Nucleic acid binder design. Structure first.
Ligand SMILES: C[S@@+](CC[C@H](N)C(=O)[O-])C[C@H]1O[C@@H](n2cnc3c(N)ncnc32)[C@H](O)[C@@H]1O
Lengths: 107, 377, 86, 93, 76, 98, 107, 93, 87, 95
DNA sequence: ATCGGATGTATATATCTGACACGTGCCTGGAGACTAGGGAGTAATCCCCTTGGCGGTTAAAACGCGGGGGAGAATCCGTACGTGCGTTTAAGCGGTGCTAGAGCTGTCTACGACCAATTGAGCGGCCTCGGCACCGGGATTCTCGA
DNA sequence: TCGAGAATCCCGGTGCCGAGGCCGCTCAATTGGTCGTAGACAGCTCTAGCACCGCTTAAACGCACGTACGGATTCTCCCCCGCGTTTTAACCGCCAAGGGGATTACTCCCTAGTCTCCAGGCACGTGTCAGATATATACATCCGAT
C-alpha cells in the first residue's frame, strides 16, 4: 500500500492534505468534500504562481534575483486585477508605485 | 522660575494641622525616616523645626533630590517661617538657588543649601511654633509635595513590585494624582470629623491625603494585594515619621490589608458612618461592581461616593429587586478629569460623584436621562 | 513621576519633516502649514482606533503583551488588511 | 512547538515559474499571509454559499462559486480553469 | 389633599386622598384611573416602600407631595 | 550667488526619492512612544511585542500615504497644488471616516 | 416540571433558545457556552430597543403612530453611534435626511 | 415550511418602549434584517476570537469582546451592561 | 425578432429628469449637462457588478430566478448591506 | 418666474423629505434585464429582487451625488461636473 | 534658444556579511483501508409567481425658448511656504542585565454535546377595524418684480 | 417694503387594506439523564521586552530670502435653469398560460470516524554569495547669463 500524496494525484505543488485539514478545522461547514481541497489548493497555487511570476519579472527588471516586499508591491499594483483583488491590502515594506500627477510637473 | 507656584491655590486649614503641643513638648527628633542618600557630592539639609536632624541628598547634575530640596526650602520660606525671617530667606537663598538649579551649578546649589542651614540655625524656634499655631492656610501644593516626598522614600525603591497584578481587567494598580484628590475632596466637601473610606486603596495615597488635608476623624483603606499592602505599611510608617519631623498632626488612619472589602466585617460596619467613599473602579469587572453595590447598601444619607466609573450600570432600572436598593437613592454627577489627574495616563476622561439621597432620584424615571446622550425632518 | 513613567504628548514626535516625507511619498508637491497639526490629529485618531481594537484582542486572550498578530487582526477588522506579520 | 506555513510550497511554485529567482523572508512572510488571506476569503465565501442553499457540505462547486465571486474577471476564469483541471486529474487517478 | 405620582415612562398622575386613606385604596384608584394591575404596583415615598397594610397617615404624607410607582414587568 | 533651486524642484526630487524607496518615513522611537502613550489609557502596563509596533507603523504610514494621495487629488481638483486641511477633511469625508 | 423559557429566566424578550440554536447551527464554533446565547440575545434586544425607541420618537415627532422605514432611517442616521454602526447599510424606503449645504442657500 | 423571524420579539420590545406605537410590515422586515445582520456580525466576530485563541467554545466572554469590537463608543458600553445584567440574572436561577 | 426580444440599450431609460431627481435628493443645486451620461455609466457599472454577483449566486443554486435574497447577498458581499428584503 | 436655483432648492427640499423611488420602475427593470442578458440563460428576476436592485442603486447614486456635491463645493462651484463624480469614485476606491 | 557651473544621481568596482538555501532527524500530521450513517442527487407533483400582452389614462418626459447666473479666464496683490544654511536635538546603534510574561506540559473537574419524552411558544390562516392615504378646500408662507 | 402669485401646510371628510388580535397545530425549546473532553489552574522554562548608558551623526529646528501661487476682483459669455406645449410611455388593472421553485419520497455514494503506517516537512545547523555599502566618477538635469 504505497502512499501517494493527494497533491501528487492532482498535480499540484500546494498541500491538498493541509488544505483539507484547514477546511475541516475552520468550522466552515459540517463536512468538507473530497474535491474541495484539491480545487482550493489549485486556486491558491494559481494565484501564488501569478503573484510570484509578476514579482519575478519586477525583480528581473531591477537586476535582482531575490523577490523583496517592494517587488511584490510593484507586481500587485501594476496589474489591475490583482490590485482590485488586493485593493484593501497593505503590503509591509512595499512602498508606493512611482507616480507624479501631471499638473505637478514643471511646464 | 521658582520650584513652587507661589500664586497657586492656597488650601484653607479647617483643623489644627500643625501639632503645636507636640512641638512645644519635644525639641529632639527621634524618628528615623528613610534617608534620601540611601535611595538608589552630597549636601545636608537642616530641618526647620528640629535642630538635631540633617537630611543628606546626593547632589549631582549628572527621583530629583535637587527639585525636592528646592521645593522644601521654598515651602519653608512660604509656610513655616514668620516675618521678618521669611522675607530675608526669600531674598537671600531663593534667587541663588534657582539660578544654580537652572544652570546646574552643583557648587552653587550646595553653597545655597549651606547658607540656608546657617541662616535657619539662628532663628528662634518659639517664633516658628508661634507662626505654625497662627497659620490658617497653606499652599495646595505643600501637602502634595510632602506626600510625594513620602512616596519617593517608600514606593519608588519597590515601585516595580506594584506591577505583579496577574489580571488585565481586575486588581490593576493605578493611582489618582494629588491634584485630582484635592479637587474631588473640595467638591465632596470633606470636613473635620468626617469619615473617609477608600475601597481598593493601593498604596494608600488617598487615605493619607484625606487624613492630612481634611482632618478626617478616621480615614480607612482596604487592600488585597500583598505587595501593595507591604508598600502601604512602609508608606504609612514613613508618613508618620515625616509628619513628626514637620510637627504635622496625623489623624486616625486605619488599613485592612491583604483582605478584600467583600464580605469584610470592618468595611461593613464602617460604611454606615462613612461620609465619603472613594472607589477607583476604572477596571472593576461587573461582579466586583455588584459586590461593591452589596457593600454600599448600608451607606447613609449624604455619603458621597467618588468613582472613575458610574456605580450604577448605565442601563440600571427599578422593576422588582431594586425598591430596597441604595443605588436608587444616588444622584450621579459626571465631571471631566483634568490633564495630569491620574497616574496611569495623561489624557484624562470622566469621573462620577454619587450622593446618597433621602428619596429616590428623579433622574432615572425620565427616559431622557437613561439615554446615551429632536428626531424630525 | 509616580509608579509609571507617564508619557507627555509625543504627537509632536510625528514631526513636520516626517509628515512632509509622508506627503512627498504620496505625490504631494506643496503642503500647507496647517497640514501638520491636522495630520497629527488624523494619525492620532487612526492609531487610537487600531490600538483600541488590538488591546481589546489582547484583553480577551488574558495577555498583557500586544502581539503583532493582534495588530494584524485589528487592522483586518477595519478593512486595513496588513501582510508580512502573519 | 511546530508553526506551519506555506513557505515550502510558495518556494516550489517560485522555482517552477522562475528557476533562478530567490525570495526573501519578508517577501516569504508576505506571500504566506497572502495565501492565508485568500484561503480565508474563499473558505468563508464557500461557507456562506453552503449556508444560503441550506447545504451542509463544501463541495468543489461551492469553492468554484466562491472563486467566481471573489477573484476579479480574468483571474476568476483562469483560477476556475486550473481548479477544474486539478479536480479532474485528481478524480481520474 | 392633592398628591402627584411619577412613573418610569415620564408621566405625572394627580390623585386626591385624605391622610386616613389606606394604601390599597390608593392602588385601587390607580387601577380605575390608569388600568394597571394592583399587584404590579409598588409605591415609593422618600426611598421607603409603602406597605399595603399601613395607611398614608402612618408615613406622614404632606400636602402636594411626590410619589413614585414601579411596575413589575417580569422581575427576576 | 549660491546655486539655489527654484521652488517646487526639490519637492519633486523628494517625491521621486520617496516613491522609489520603502523605508519607514516616521522615525522608530517617536512612533513607538506615541503607540505606548495611546495604550496608556488602559491601566494595565502593556508590553507591545516589537513586531507589533512595527506593524502599527507599517499600517499607519500606508494609511497616511493613501490619505495624502487622496488629499493631493482633492487639491489638484480645486486648481491648486497646495494641500490644505479642507482637502484632508474632504478626503476623509468621502472615504467614510467622517 | 413546568417549562420555563430561558428568555424569561434572563428577563429578556428576545429568544435565548432560538439564539442558541442559531449559534449551534451556524458553525460559529464546535461548542457554544450556555451564557453566550443569553448575552447575545440581550445585546440584540438592547440594540432593537434603542432603534425602536428612536424610531418611535421620530414617528411621534412626525405625528404618526406607526413606524415606517423612513422613521427607521431618521432614527439610525440622526444618531452618531447607530449611524456609524450602520454606516455601510442601506435601509429600503429610507431616503436621506434634509441637508442643504450653506454654500447652496441663496445670498 | 415555517419562515422564522424576530417579528414577535421586535414587537414585544416596541411595546415595552412605546406602548401606543405600532410598526409597519416593511419596517418590521427592516428590523428583522437588522437583527439578523447584527447577530451574524457578532457571531462571526466571536467565532474569529474563538479561533484566534484556539478555543472550541463561544462563551459570554467571546460575545462581550465581540460587542466591544463592533459597537461604537457608548453603544458598546450599554450593550455590555445589558449582556452582563442578563447573564447575571440567568445564572442566578 | 428571432427567438427572444433582445432588449435595446435601455440605459437612456434612466432619463434626464430621473437623474435630476437623484441629484436633488443628494442636495445638488446645479447639474452639468455632462453629468447625465457619466452617472448613466456609473449606474451601469454598479448594476453590472451587483447583477453579476447575484446571478453567480443564482446559478450556483441551480435556479433560474434571481431571488431577492440573491440580490441582498450580492450587495452584502460588496459592503452595501440592504435591509427590508430579508437577510 | 422664480429666479434660477429657487425651484432647484424647492426640489431638494421635496425629494430629501420623501422616500419614493425616483427612477421609473419599468425602465429600470428593463435596464436590469438588459444587464443580465449577457448570461445567455433567460433569467426571471423575482420582483422583490428588482425592487431590491432599485433600492440599492438609488441609495448608491444618492450617496454618490452627495459626495459629488461635496467635491463641487470644494472647487468653489455649485454645478456638479463629471470630474466631480470621477474624483468621488476615485477617493472612494471604486476606480 | 543655447552655453557652462554646480548639483544630484546612476553607473562602476570592490568588498563584506548575515540572511538565504540546502542537508538531516524525526515526529506528527497525511495517507491507506474499512464501516456506517445521513446528506445530497434524482424523480414526481403542486401551484405560486413569473412572463407576456392588453387597453386606457395621465403623469412625466422631451422639446424649445428666454436669460441670467455661475463657470472660466485674466490680472494683480501679498504672504505663505519652498530652499539653504547653521545650529541643536535626539534617534539610532551597540552592548549589558532583569525578570516576568508567553508558552508548554500535567491534573481533573465543570460544562456542553447528545439523546429521549414532553408540550407550550410561535408561526400560518383569517377577520376587522382604524391609522394612514387621497382628495377638496382654506389658511400660511416664500418668491420676485416692482 | 409690498402685493400678486405660487408652493406648501393644514383641516376636514371619506375610503381601504394592512396591522393587530384571535384561533389551531406543529415541532422546536425545555428538562433531565450521562459522558467525553475543554480548558482552568498550577508549575516550570526561557527568551524577549524593558530599561540603562554612551557615542556618532543624521535629521530636526529655527531663521532669512524670495517668489509663485492662493485668493480676491473684474469681465465675458454660454449653458443650464425655469416655464409652456406637445408627446410618449409608465402605470394600472386585467386576463391568461405555464416555468420552475417548493416540497416530499426514495436510494445510495461520500464523508466523518478510527485505526495503523510512514514519510513530508518543520526545527536546527552550516556554507557562501546576493545585496548593501563605500568610493570614485561619468552623465543627466536644473538654472542663470547671454
Ligand atoms: C485602581 S487602584 C486605586 C488605588 C488608590 N485607591 C488610588 O486611587 O490612588 C485599585 C486597587 O484596589 C485593589 N482591589 C481591586 N479589587 C479589590 C478587591 N476586590 N478587594 C480589595 N482590593 C481590591 C487593587 O489592589 C488596586 O490596587
Amino acid at each position: 500500500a504505497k502512499a501517494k500524496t493527494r497533491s501528487s494525484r492532482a498535480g499540484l505543488q500546494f498541500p491538498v492534505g493541509r488544505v483539507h485539514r484547514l477546511l475541516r478545522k475552520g468550522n466552515y461547514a459540517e463536512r468538507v468534500g473530497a474535491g474541495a481541497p484539491v480545487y482550493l489548493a489549485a486556486v491558491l497555487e494559481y494565484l501564488t504562481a501569478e503573484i510570484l511570476e509578476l514579482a519575478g519579472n519586477a525583480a528581473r527588471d531591477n537586476k535582482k534575483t531575490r523577490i523583496i516586499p517592494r517587488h511584490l508591491q510593484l507586481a500587485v499594483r501594476n496589474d489591475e486585477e490583482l490590485n482590485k483583488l488586493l485593493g484593501r491590502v497593505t503590503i509591509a515594506q512595499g512602498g508606493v508605485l512611482p507616480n507624479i500627477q501631471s499638473v505637478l510637473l514643471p511646464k | 522660575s521658582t520650584f513652587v507656584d507661589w500664586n497657586g491655590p492656597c488650601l484653607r486649614l479647617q483643623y489644627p494641622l500643625f501639632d503645636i503641643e507636640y512641638l512645644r513638648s519635644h525639641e529632639i527628633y527621634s524618628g528615623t525616616p528613610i534617608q534620601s542618600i540611601s535611595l538608589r557630592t552630597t549636601a545636608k539639609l537642616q530641618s526647620i523645626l528640629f535642630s538635631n536632624y540633617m537630611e543628606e541628598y546626593k547632589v549631582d547634575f549628572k527621583y530629583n533630590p535637587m527639585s525636592e530640596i528646592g521645593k522644601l526650602i521654598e515651602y519653608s520660606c512660604l509656610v513655616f517661617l514668620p516675618s521678618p525671617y521669611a522675607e530675608q530667606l526669600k531674598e537671600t537663598i531663593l534667587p541663588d538657588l534657582n539660578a544654580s538649579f537652572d544652570n546646574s551649578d552643583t557648587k552653587g546649589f550646595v553653597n545655597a543649601i549651606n547658607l540656608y542651614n546657617k541662616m535657619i540655625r539662628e532663628i528662634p524656634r518659639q517664633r516658628i511654633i508661634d507662626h505654625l499655631e497662627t497659620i490658617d492656610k497653606i499652599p495646595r501644593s505643600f501637602i502634595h509635595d510632602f506626600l510625594h516626598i513620602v512616596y519617593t522614600r517608600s514606593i519608588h525603591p519597590q515601585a516595580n513590585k506594584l506591577k505583579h497584578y496577574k489580571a488585565f481587567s481586575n486588581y490593576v494598580y493605578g493611582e489618582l494624582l494629588p491634584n485630582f484628590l484635592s479637587d474631588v475632596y473640595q467638591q465632596c466637601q470633606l470636613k473635620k470629623g468626617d469619615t473617609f473610606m477608600d475601597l481598593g486603596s493601593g498604596v494608600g495615597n488617598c487615605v493619607v491625603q484625606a487624613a492630612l488635608e481634611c482632618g478626617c476623624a478616621l480615614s480607612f483603606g482596604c487592600e488585597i494585594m500583598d505587595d501593595a499592602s507591604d508598600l502601604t505599611i512602609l508608606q504609612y510608617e514613613e508618613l508618620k515619621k515625616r509628619c513628626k519631623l514637620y510637627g504635622m498632626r496625623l489623624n486616625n488612619v486605619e488599613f485592612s490589608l491583604k483582605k478584600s472589602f467583600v464580605d469584610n466585617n470592618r468595611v461593613a460596619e464602617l460604611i454606615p458612618q462613612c461620609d465619603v467613599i472613594l472607589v477607583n473602579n476604572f477596571l472593576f469587572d461587573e461582579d466586583l461592581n455588584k459586590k461593591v453595590e452589596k457593600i454600599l447598601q448600608t451607606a447613609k444619607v449624604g455619603c458621597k461616593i467618588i468613582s472613575l466609573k458610574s456605580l450604577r450600570s448605565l442601563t440600571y432600572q427599578i422593576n422588582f429587586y431594586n425598591v430596597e436598593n441604595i443605588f436608587n437613592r444616588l444622584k450621579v454627577q459626571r465631571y471631566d478629569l483634568k490633564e495630569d489627574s491620574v497616574s496611569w495616563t495623561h489624557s484624562g476622561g470622566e469621573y462620577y460623584i454619587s450622593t446618597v439621597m433621602e428619596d429616590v432620584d428623579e433622574s432615572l424615571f425620565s427616559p431622557a436621562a437613561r439615554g446615551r446622550r429632536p428626531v424630525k425632518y | 513621576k509616580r509608579h509609571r513613567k507617564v508619557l507627555r504628548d509625543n504627537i509632536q514626535g510625528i514631526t513636520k519633516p516626517a509628515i512632509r516625507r509622508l506627503a512627498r511619498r504620496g505625490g504631494v508637491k506643496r503642503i500647507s502649514g496647517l497640514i501638520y497639526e491636522e495630520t497629527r490629529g488624523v494619525l492620532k485618531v487612526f492609531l487610537e482606533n487600531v490600538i483600541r481594537d488590538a488591546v481589546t484582542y489582547t484583553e480577551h486572550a488574558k495577555r498583557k503583551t500586544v502581539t503583532a498578530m493582534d495588530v494584524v487582526y485589528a487592522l483586518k477588522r477595519q478593512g486595513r488588511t496588513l501582510y508580512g506579520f502573519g | 512547538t511546530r508553526k506551519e506555513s506555506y513557505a515550502i510550497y510558495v518556494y516550489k511554485v517560485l522555482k517552477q515559474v522562475h528557476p533562478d529567482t530567490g525570495i526573501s523572508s519578508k517577501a516569504m512572510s508576505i506571500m504566506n499571509s497572502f495565501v492565508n488571506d485568500v484561503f480565508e476569503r474563499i473558505a468563508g465565501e464557500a461557507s456562506r454559499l453552503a449556508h444560503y442553499n441550506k447545504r451542509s457540505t463544501i463541495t468543489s462547486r461551492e469553492i468554484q462559486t466562491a472563486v467566481r465571486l471573489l477573484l476579479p474577471g480574468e483571474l476568476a476564469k483562469h483560477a476556475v480553469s486550473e481548479g477544474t483541471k486539478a479536480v479532474t486529474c485528481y478524480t481520474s487517478a | 389633599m392633592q398628591i402627584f405620582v411619577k412613573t418610569l415612562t415620564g408621566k405625572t398622575i394627580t390623585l386626591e386622598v385624605e391622610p386616613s386613606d389606606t394604601i390599597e385604596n390608593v392602588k385601587a384608584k390607580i387601577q380605575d384611573k390608569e388600568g394597571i394591575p394592583p399587584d404590579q404596583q409598588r409605591l415609593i415615598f422618600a426611598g421607603k416602600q409603602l406597605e399595603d397594610g399601613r395607611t398614608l397617615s402612618d408615613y406622614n404624607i404632606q400636602k402636594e407631595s411626590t410619589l413614585h410607582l414601579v411596575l413589575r414587568l417580569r422581575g427576576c | 550667488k549660491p546655486h539655489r533651486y527654484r521652488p517646487g524642484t526639490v519637492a519633486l526630487r523628494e517625491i521621486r526619492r520617496y516613491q522609489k524607496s520603502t523605508e519607514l518615513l516616521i522615525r522608530k522611537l517617536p512612533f513607538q512612544r506615541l503607540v505606548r502613550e495611546i495604550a496608556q489609557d488602559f491601566m494595565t502596563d502593556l508590553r507591545f511585542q516589537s513586531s507589533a509596533v512595527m506593524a502599527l507603523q507599517e499600517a499607519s504610514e500606508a494609511y497616511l500615504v493613501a490619505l495624502f494621495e487622496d488629499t493631493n487629488l482633492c487639491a489638484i481638483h480645486a486648481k491648486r497644488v497646495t494641500i490644505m486641511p479642507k482637502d484632508i477633511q474632504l478626503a476623509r469625508r468621502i472615504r467614510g471616516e467622517r
